[PDB]
């Protein structure tokens, strides 16, 4: 399996689809997105890769996206799907029981607390319960059939708060806040923890990384990344965490770092073909 990265931004929103591989360290160029997009999220359901939300920030516009598009690795074709109820730039997404959850994001000045849910078999969206908090740049992960919305930006305050969605019950509950305020962090699940890597705290991009232990309801720091970054892509591959690109306050990163939990160390694994922020990432 490979690490797919879709979209992103460098001087303008990008159409790139590229696939990386632990084993041989090779970068592969695949079919372009049909509409450029940055600030999207990526996820895999079935064996199909989905690009959700974002915006097309171009020399001729800056259009927030409600689009859902689906990539089949078997066919190398992007296929459009039904669109979300609203555009969601800087969206977060998680997958529960083959359903895609779209969390927060912005449309113009509107910072969403709304959440909606997609079913690939029926190709259609519905509104579920909204978060307690408006959040863009929100990190989202799924642990034991529960969905977590972590950090982000409400329009004025960047957030260290996190809340959890109970699908059986359609209720959001606040949990213990992170030690660090983080918007545009990379958020994933590795083993039985929710990791939050990097982000922006309103003053600095961060290299720190913390993880939430659901049993103890406690956030604890782990080893920091080499390079501070926000708006990074992140995914789990072979029980290791990869972070891809991002922005550090001046430079668009091509750096890719890899976290090994057994050794608690980050190692620079590769570089993307070009630096960019705001990608969507997933593995299949």
């Amino acid at each position: 399996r490979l690490i797919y990265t879709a979209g992103g931004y460098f001087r303008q929103s990008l159409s790139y689809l590229e696939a990386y591989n632990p084993s041989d360290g090779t970068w592969l160029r695949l079919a372009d997105l049909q509409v450029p997009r940055s600030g999207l999220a990526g996820c895999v359901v079935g064996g199909l890769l989905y690009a959700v939300g974002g915006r097309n920030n171009s020399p001729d516009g800056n259009t927030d996206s409600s689009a859902l598009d689906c990539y089949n690795p078997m066919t190398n074709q992007w296929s459009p799907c039904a669109p979300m109820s609203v555009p969601r730039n800087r969206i977060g997404v998680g997958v529960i029981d083959g359903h895609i959850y779209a969390v927060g994001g912005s449309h113009g000045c509107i910072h969403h607390n709304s959440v909606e849910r997609y079913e690939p078999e029926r190709d259609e969206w519905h509104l579920v319960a909204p978060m307690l908090t408006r959040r863009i740049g929100v990190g989202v992960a799924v642990l034991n059939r529960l969905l977590y919305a972590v950090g982000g930006f409400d329009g004025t305050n960047r957030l260290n708060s996190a809340e959890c969605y109970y699908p059986e019950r359609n209720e959001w509950r606040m949990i213990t806040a992170m030690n660090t305020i983080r918007s545009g962090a990379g958020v994933c699940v590795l083993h039985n923890c929710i990791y939050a890597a990097g982000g922006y705290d309103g003053q600095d991009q961060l290299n720190s990384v913390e993880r939430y232990d659901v049993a103890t309801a406690t956030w604890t720091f782990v080893a920091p990344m080499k390079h501070r970054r926000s708006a990074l892509g992140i995914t789990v591959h072979q029980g290791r965490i990869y972070v891809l690109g991002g922005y550090d306050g001046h430079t668009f990163l091509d750096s890719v770092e890899c976290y090994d939990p057994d050794t608690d160390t980050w190692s620079e694994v590769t570089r993307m073909t070009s630096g960019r922020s705001g990608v969507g990432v997933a593995v299949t």
Partner: peptide, 9 residues
């Protein structure tokens, strides 16, 4: 520029 993503505002 967006301080967090680098995108042109």
């Amino acid at each position: 520029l967006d301080e967090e993503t680098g995108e042109f505002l």
